Amino acid sequence: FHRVDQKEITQLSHLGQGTRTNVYEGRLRLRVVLKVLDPSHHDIALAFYETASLMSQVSHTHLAFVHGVCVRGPENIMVTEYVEHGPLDVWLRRERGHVPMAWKMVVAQQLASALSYLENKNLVHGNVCGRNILLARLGLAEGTSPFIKLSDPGVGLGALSREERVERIPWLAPECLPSTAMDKWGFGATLLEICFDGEAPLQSRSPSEKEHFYQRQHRLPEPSCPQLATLTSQCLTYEPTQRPSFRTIL
Amino acid sequence: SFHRVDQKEITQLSHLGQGTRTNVYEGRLRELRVVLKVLDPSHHDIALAFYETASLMSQVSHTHLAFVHGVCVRGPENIMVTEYVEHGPLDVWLRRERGHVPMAWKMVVAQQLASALSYLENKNLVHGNVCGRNILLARLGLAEGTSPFIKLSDPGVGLGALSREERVERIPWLAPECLPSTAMDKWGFGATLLEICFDGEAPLRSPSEKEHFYQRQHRLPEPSCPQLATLTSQCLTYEPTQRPSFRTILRDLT
Ligand SMILES: CNC(=O)c1cnc(Nc2ccc(F)cn2)cc1Nc1ccccc1C(N)=O
Ligand SMILES: CNC(=O)c1cnc(Nc2ccc(F)cn2)cc1Nc1ccccc1C(N)=O
Numbered sequence: 419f420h421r422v423d424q425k426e427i428t429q430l431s432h433l434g435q436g437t438r439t440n441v442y443e444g445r446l447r448l449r450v451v452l453k454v455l456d457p458s459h460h461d462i463a464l465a466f467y468e469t470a471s472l473m474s475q476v477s478h479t480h481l482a483f484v485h486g487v488c489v490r491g492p493e494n495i496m497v498t499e500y501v502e503h504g505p506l507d508v509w510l511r512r513e514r515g516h517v518p519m520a521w522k523m524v525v526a527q528q529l530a531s532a533l534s535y536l537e538n539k540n541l542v543h544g545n546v547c548g549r550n551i552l553l554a555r556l557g558l559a560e561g562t563s564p565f566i567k568l569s570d571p572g573v574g575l576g577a578l579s580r581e582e583r584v585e586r587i588p589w590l591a592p593e594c595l596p597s598t599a600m601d602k603w604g605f606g607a608t609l610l611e612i613c614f615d616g617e618a619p620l621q622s623r624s625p626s627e628k629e630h631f632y633q634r635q636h637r638l639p640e641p642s643c644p645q646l647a648t649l650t651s652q653c654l655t656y657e658p659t660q661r662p663s664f665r666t667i668l
Numbered sequence: 669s670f671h672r673v674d675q676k677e678i679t680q681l682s683h684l685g686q687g688t689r690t691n692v693y694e695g696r697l698r699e700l701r702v703v704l705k706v707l708d709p710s711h712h713d714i715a716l717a718f719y720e721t722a723s724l725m726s727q728v729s730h731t732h733l734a735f736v737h738g739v740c741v742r743g744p745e746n747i748m749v750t751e752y753v754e755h756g757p758l759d760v761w762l763r764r765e766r767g768h769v770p771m772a773w774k775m776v777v778a779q780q781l782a783s784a785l786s787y788l789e790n791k792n793l794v795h796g797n798v799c800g801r802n803i804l805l806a807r808l809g810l811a812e813g814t815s816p817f818i819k820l821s822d823p824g825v826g827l828g829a830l831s832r833e834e835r836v837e838r839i840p841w842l843a844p845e846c847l848p849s850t851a852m853d854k855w856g857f858g859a860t861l862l863e864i865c866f867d868g869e870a871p872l873r874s875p876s877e878k879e880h881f882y883q884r885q886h887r888l889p890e891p892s893c894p895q896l897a898t899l900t901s902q903c904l905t906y907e908p909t910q911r912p913s914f915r916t917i918l919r920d921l922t
Contacts, residue, residue, distance in 0.1 A: 516696065516699060554811060555754065555811060556754060557754075558701040558752065558754065559701060559752055559753055559754045559806065560700065562754055562806075562807075565811055
């Protein structure tokens with residue numbers, strides 16, 4: 419990745435928080451988003467640099483751009499693309515009950531296209547969820563279509579604690595609780611989240627209840643949209659090898 | 669004239685901005701995404717000028733003119749239900765993108781605006797409120813890379829119903845002969861080309877200073893873009909009859 423000097427960036431409004439990060443709007447000497455990692459252990463910083471490296475070596479219409487990394491004292495900052503309308507799950511909740519099925523199907527194909535590209539290069543995202551799908555275009559006007567970008571996955575999944583992995587249920591693949599196959603589960607859980615207008619299954623459950631659900635191999639709900647019922651059931655199987663490829667899904 | 673929309677058919681969503689005696693909101697029409705132009709509580713003569721705009725826009729059809737769905741009366745509020753475009757007003761977008769809007773992009777917008785105005789001129793219809801704020805971006809042409817697409821918004825409350833103070837606030841888009849005809853839209857068009865060339869920074873100042881500028885017949889700046897210098901000078905002439913027709917302007921833009 420490219421090294422960004424702190425003199426080149428300006429930090430502005432707080433947008434949200436990610437795993438061990440704070441997300442801000444900023445400027446790059448361009449409007450950008452700064453993902454500021456908390457003062458962390460070197461294993462976390464390394465997992466953060468690996469994500470920056472991954473995202474800097476890939477290029478796809480539906481993957482967000484990474485400008486580089488800035489080290490500012492104990493803070494590691496990923497300088498990333500600012501996407502106009504921000505996270506999908508937030509927008510879906512605000513528009514609940516008024517998002518058509520045809521709109522949701524365009525998003526699903528766009529996400530599957532980004533993930534087919536990653537699968538073809540044997541690259542793992544590991545954090546596919548509605549919060550990480552950014553809306554570049556809303557597709558609300560007649561004769562327009564939405565346009566998404568999959569955000570970077572942030573701190574790599576391998577560096578997170580068990581508690582953080584439990585917090586990621588139901589997007590977390592069950593084999594990760596104790597491969598590219600994990601993104602098929604994340605994709606399936608995100609399609610459920612989309613079908614339910616940004617209300618993910620198991621959102622009102624405790625960490626203990628979420629861990630129990632996976633330990634007993636309980637299966638996530640069938641979506642309310644019949645067009646994605648078979649696809650989600652095939653993606654949300656506990657046996658990773660039985661999940662379909664993104665070429666097939668797409 | 670226009671379709672009547674019952675308030676049960678509309679949902680009022682987020683505030684987008686304000687126009688002359690109006691508040692603009694995003695909305696839904698039973699669904700389609702729309703924009704609701706909510707007129708302030710007004711006298712009957714102001715409401716009538718608002719209905720006249722709704723009637724005008726409902727009787728015309730052009731790919732670069734915004735569609736009007738109809739009018740809803742909600743207590744003392746008159747609401748024009750209009751077409752929603754994804755990216756909003758041109759002047760706002762230009763200021764945010766200042767310094768990286770190429771000249772070829774600005775020329776597509778100019779041709780598209782001249783096309784809408786040639787259509788109105790051919791029907792002897794006056795817009796009276798051509799400005800960057802009223803040019804709506806349906807497409808930026810950036811994600812797909814294929815060029816912008818605009819819609820000229822409705823003119824809102826008819827210019828004839830506004831006060832002198834409101835007309836002075838509309839300088840430099842206001843034609844000077846309107847301070848105390850389709851010719852007025854050439855001036856508005858010319859002032860909008862300047863505004864576009866300057867990345868949404870229009871020329872001109874206090875109301876008194878703007879009124880003096882017109883009283884002394886001072887001429888607006890020459891644009892920084894040499895491709896539109898002659899066209900703007902011809903459109904921004906104080907003698908209305910000396911302004912070129914939109915048929916001519918539209919052929920010159922090719
Ligand atoms: C790689 N780039 C991004 O992740 C990114 C790009 N554009 C954004 N626009 C935006 C626009 C309006 C608004 F109100 C909020 N955000 C937000 C972004 N991140 C987030 C922002 C907040 C919470 C989570 C994320 C995240 N998943 O990182
Ligand atoms: C006839 N239809 C319209 O005029 C109209 C259509 N679509 C819009 N989309 C949009 C999308 C995102 C956003 F941030 C803001 N706007 C804005 C519109 N009006 C305006 C909105 C604000 C201020 C003035 C006008 C105006 N000139 O009336």
